[PDB]
Design a protein around this ligand. Structure first.
Ligand SMILES: Cc1ccnc(CNC(=O)Cn2c(C)c[nH+]c(NCC(F)(F)c3cccc[nH+]3)c2=O)c1F
Lengths: 26, 250, 11
């Protein structure tokens, strides 16, 4: 269950800057 | 953290605070990798040049925190240490090579909305995500400038090409470390700072949406200086040691 | 400027 946050991934909510990370994995 | 921003509640449930009993003070950051184990930088516990040599009974681990100085009643959990394991080849004499240490808690910590372990990378994950240009995230209660934040700070930094890391310092860089941060002409800034040591450098896998700890805040020359970069312990490179300690001592 | 943590932990 590691790496899945209760208040985010588990509820399908994103934190305010994680998109910046994914956007860099081109 | 320099040039970062306040973290959202529950944003880094694996973030751990290394707290000194007396005088009560923040020592370093750390991360939760299981209900019983914590990962941090060895220099947080041992560094002869500054007469630093802490034992299990000298520190406390505080998990689930957001506020730096407040005792977050009913939210954070404080735990004692049963044992500390430092890499036998940690090089404190020269360049902090293999700057890593494991800490076994006396009792398992119960998970909650604010306490949750981060994943350790497998060969495949490390291979695909640890690439120059790719961004990771650093968190900590360290200084805001080379004063102290009210709550946990966060900053996203790109991994930098090894040649550039090498050419920015006089220190001998090894395969057990990588550096990160923006280049002077990229416009954006950000870096870890005093107090942030031992903290986690994490990345989110676009394959399974899980967060993985790729590095440990290790060292730097100043904080957020142009032409300089922060260095991190390469977690995967030392996973063989991590696995050995875990299945051999509990 | 750290807030007093419970003695039950400092024991
Ligand atoms: C990534 C990062 C950026 C800024 N500050 C820190 C805080 N980390 C430390 O203070 C650890 N740390 C220690 C123990 C000793 N000397 C440090 N820097 C000075 C140095 F770069 F010349 C150096 C590096 C390794 C061994 C001896 N001298 C250092 O950075 C960071 F971990």
């Amino acid at each position: 269950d590691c790496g899945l946050r209760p208040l985010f991934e588990k509820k399908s909510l994103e934190d305010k800057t994680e998109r910046e990370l994914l956007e860099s994995y081109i | 953290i320099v040039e970062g921003s306040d973290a959202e509640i529950g944003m880094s449930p694996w973030q751990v605070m290394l707290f000194r009993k007396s005088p009560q003070e923040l020592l370093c950051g750390a991360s939760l990798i299981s209900d019983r184990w914590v990962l941090t930088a060895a220099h947080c516990l041992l560094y002869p040049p500054w007469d630093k040599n802490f034992t299990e009974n000298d520190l406390l681990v505080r998990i689930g925190k957001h506020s730096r100085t407040r005792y977050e009643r009913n939210i954070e959990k404080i735990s004692m240490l049963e044992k500390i394991y430092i890499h036998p080849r940690y090089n404190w004499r020269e360049n902090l090579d293999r700057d890593i240490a494991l800490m076994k808690l006396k009792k398992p910590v119960a998970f909650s909305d604010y306490i949750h372990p981060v994943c350790l990378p497998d060969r495949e994950t490390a291979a695909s995500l640890l690439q120059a240009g790719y961004k990771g995230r650093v968190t900590g209660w360290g200084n805001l400038k080379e004063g102290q934040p009210s709550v946990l700070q966060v900053v996203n930094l790109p991994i930098v090409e090894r040649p550039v890391c090498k050419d920015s310092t006089r220190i001998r860089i090894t395969d057990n470390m990588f550096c990160a941060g923006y280049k002077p002409d990229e416009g954006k800034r950000g870096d870890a700072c005093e107090g942030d040591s031992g903290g986690p450098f994490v990345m989110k896998s676009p394959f399974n949406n899980r967060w993985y700890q790729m590095g440990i805040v290790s060292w730097g020359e100043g904080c957020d200086r142009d032409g300089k970069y922060g260095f991190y312990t390469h977690v995967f490179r030392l996973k063989k040691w991590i696995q050995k300690v875990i299945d051999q001592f509990g | 400027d750290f807030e007093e943590i419970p003695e039950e932990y400092l024991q």
